[PDB]
From a paper:
During our studies, it became clear that [name]-[name].1 exhibits conformational diversity and can swap half the number of its residues to form a dimer.
Residues 2–57 are well-defined by electron density, whereas the remaining residues are disordered in this crystal form. As expected, the archetypical [name] fold of a β-sheet curved into a half-barrel is conserved. The side chains interacting with [name]ϵ (black lines in Fig. 7A) are in similar conformations as in the NMR solution structure. The largest differences are in the two N-terminal residues, outside the peptide-binding region.
Residue numbers in the entry: 2 to 57
The structure:
């Protein structure tokens, strides 16, 4: 499993996106396009932009 941390807040605009807060711990499901699929601490999933998260 790969953990990434949110660099910035992101507000979901589409049902398949995920709301994230800066410094939130996330798990990376798919990094093969510019929408990255992530999972949060409560096992909700969705897409966030690649530039919003990084491996610490």
């Amino acid at each position: 499993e790969v953990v990434v941390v949110a660099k910035f807040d992101y507000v979901a605009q589409q049902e398949q996106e995920l709301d994230i807060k800066k410094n939130e711990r996330l798990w990376l499901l798919d990094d093969s396009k510019s929408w990255w699929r992530v999972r949060n601490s409560m096992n909700k999933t969705g897409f966030v932009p690649s530039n919003y998260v990084e491996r610490k």
